[PDB]
From a paper:
Glucosamine-6-phosphate N-acetyltransferase 1 (GNA1) produces GlcNAc-6-phosphate from GlcN-6-phosphate and acetyl coenzyme A. Early mercury-labelling experiments implicated a conserved cysteine in the reaction mechanism, whereas recent structural data appear to support a mechanism in which this cysteine plays no role. GlcN-6P is then acetylated by the enzyme glucos­amine-6-phosphate N-acetyltransferase 1 (GNA1), followed by conversion to GlcN-1P by a phosphomutase (AGM1) and finally generation of UDP-GlcNAc by the action of a pyrophosphorylase. GNA1 is a member of the Gcn5-related N-acetyltransferase (GNAT) superfamily. Here, two crystal structures of Caenorhabditis elegans GNA1 are reported, revealing an unusual covalent complex between this cysteine and the coenzyme A product.
Residue numbers in the entry:
A (entry chain A): 1 to 165
B (entry chain B): 2 to 165
Amino acid sequence: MSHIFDASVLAPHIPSNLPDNFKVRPLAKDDFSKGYVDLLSQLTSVGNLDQEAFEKRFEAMRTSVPNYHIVVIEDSNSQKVVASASLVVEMKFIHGAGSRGRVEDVVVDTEMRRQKLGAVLLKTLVSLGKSLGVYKISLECVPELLPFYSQFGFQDDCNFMTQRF
Amino acid sequence: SHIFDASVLAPHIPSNLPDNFKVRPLAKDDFSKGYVDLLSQLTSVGNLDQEAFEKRFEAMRTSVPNYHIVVIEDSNSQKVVASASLVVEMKFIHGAGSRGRVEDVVVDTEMRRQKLGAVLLKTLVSLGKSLGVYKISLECVPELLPFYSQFGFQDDCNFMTQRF
Ligand SMILES: *SCCNC(=O)CCNC(=O)[C@H](O)C(C)(C)COP(=O)(O)OP(=O)(O)OC[C@H]1O[C@@H](n2cnc3c(N)ncnc32)[C@H](O)[C@@H]1OP(=O)(O)O
Ligand SMILES: *SCCNC(=O)CCNC(=O)[C@H](O)C(C)(C)COP(=O)(O)OP(=O)(O)OC[C@H]1O[C@@H](n2cnc3c(N)ncnc32)[C@H](O)[C@@H]1OP(=O)(O)O
């Protein structure tokens, strides 16, 4: 039904190099029925997420400002969501009330990999976050993904700490 | 106008800190208590005047999850001398879980090595656990390992960044 953010803000950022069966768009409320939770399960554990919790969380995200820019790719051949990536923006006071962007939950369906859907999403989100005015954008991942992330500007960084246990 | 609720902060503030220090949420009038001069000791604050401060503070105060910005005010100067933020990212993964990030940690240069930084980290790790976050992280510099290792944190280089 509804989109998690306005598809008009995303439109200028979507590249043009994907086959016509791919549609890049905001997550939508009825993407549960399009396999979104199955997609997330390929990334990590979804725990007890079910459709009611998915819809409630989707509403909470949809009313947030800055928006949760959760961008998906729907394969029109199957009408399933086959890729997802999130650009989440934290408001700051530093840098003149600037914004700090993070690219999270990046996943492409395992059968659909090496068709460029991953690069399309990271390119779209990097362009969206620059346009939004973010001063710093980051990705938490293993950069075995070296070739991949660097061509969009990301550099290895170790100014990040997690808990030991 | 407080950025988040003092009653939520209360159980996580450690005991018997010296009495010239008050640990509390960031307040809209903290601009007049030297908040910008404190943040400058962390990085460029740009042209953050009172009007822009207040516009941004209100945008953050109405966001859910809240921006858990905790500051320490010193009596002996009536100035904000320390600040740290716990910012919470909603997820769908982990049962519509939530991810906590400790950010913008800074103690005024004249007030360092009096445990203010430690109080802020203990407070925010305890508050993040209460909020039910499944993972918490810190962004800091590796040179400061002898500080952050005291609150469970260790360096994690599965991270990439760029400045625009
Ligand atoms: S932690 C953040 C990343 N998310 C995950 O790691 C979750 C699981 N992995 C994925 O969902 C996908 O494997 C990701 C990493 C999102 C990649 O998506 P795509 O497969 O759609 O990537 P592209 O087709 O756009 O790939 C472009 C370039 O990526 C490099 N590359 C991808 N995968 C590999 C592997 N497996 N081994 C070596 N290199 C890989 C290549 O430079 C690739 O260009 P090619 O023309 O495909 O060689
Ligand atoms: S996450 C940090 C990113 N922020 C900054 O880099 C901003 C500039 N730095 C600061 O604001 C302060 O130096 C920080 C890093 C916030 C620490 O604040 P405090 O000065 O209040 O620290 P504590 O008194 O709580 O220190 C507790 C123990 O941590 C170690 N420690 C603090 N500072 C250092 C330095 N610079 N180098 C090595 N260790 C440091 C000490 O073990 C300290 O215990 P002592 O009992 O003082 O030795």
